[PDB]
């Protein structure tokens, strides 16, 4: 052949979001989170027009419960923690 390439459409796609030590609490990094990552909905893909970039039209805030596992203490601490996940619902190629 080879088979012609199909452009990656500007649309919502299942992505993996890493639950980072920085965003929720900034006290230090030496605390582990469970689960370490979760699935999210994001805008990914390309635009046919040059000038344009793929962008979210509207987002949805989704809170989830995780656990903070503090290691650098006299004893282990397994604390509940809420993390706000940003999900994209619609994507469109926008003028810039």
């Amino acid at each position, epitope marked *: 052949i080879a088979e012609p390439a199909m452009i990656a459409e500007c649309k919502t796609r299942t992505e993996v979001f890493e639950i980072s030590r920085r965003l929720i609490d900034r006290t230090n990094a030496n605390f582990l989170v*469970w689960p370490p990552c979760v699935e999210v909905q994001r805008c990914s893909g390309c635009c046919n027009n040059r000038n344009v970039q793929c962008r979210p039209t509207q987002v949805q805030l989704r809170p989830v419960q995780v*656990r903070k596992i503090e290691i650098v*203490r006299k*004893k*282990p*601490i397994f*604390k*509940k923690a809420t993390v706000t996940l940003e999900d994209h619902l619609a994507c469109k190629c926008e003028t810039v």
Partner: antibody
Amino acid sequence: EVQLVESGGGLVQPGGSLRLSCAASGFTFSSYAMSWVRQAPGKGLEWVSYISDDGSLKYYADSVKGRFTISRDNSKNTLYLQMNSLRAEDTAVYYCARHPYWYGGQLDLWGQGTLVTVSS
Amino acid sequence: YELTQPPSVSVAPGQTARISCSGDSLGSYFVHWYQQKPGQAPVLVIYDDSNRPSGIPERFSGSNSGNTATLTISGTQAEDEADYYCSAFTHNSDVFGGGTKLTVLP
């Protein structure tokens, strides 16, 4: 059949030392975090020490800090507790217990316990 | 500090036993419950506030919110007579509560 068996308990003098052992069987001992929990006669449960699945992280209660040492031999499927500078208040039944998850503090499996009496 | 439990709870057979456990911001931590019969090792009856391990009867249920965790035993039988210990790994030095002895009337 999943099991934990403590040994090494006995009568000991104050300021003396004792090493406790805990033999694990029926499961992969290396994949689990472990704790020592003690119970004075007629009294309640007191967490003593915690050890990571690999032995990297070791935690102690303030009542045993500087005197007790936790360790493990994953090749032998054995948990250890080295108790030095023993005091009458250290008299208890010593339990060996398994944390089913690295991210959890609950205790899945317990041994039958080993009695340590500290007296002059 | 300390995880506070009533030293004893008395109930009539078939009634609902409620054993409390109090600690500073306890609701923001995971609470486990252990059942201990004389001469026996503790048994995990509830983990992570409300979860029952396999082999634990439906009678046992738990909750944790705010400052207090509660163990609930509906349809209390003679075989439920034991010492109950709450447990949590928090910022305070005590991993276990003082215990509650559950007794069945008369």
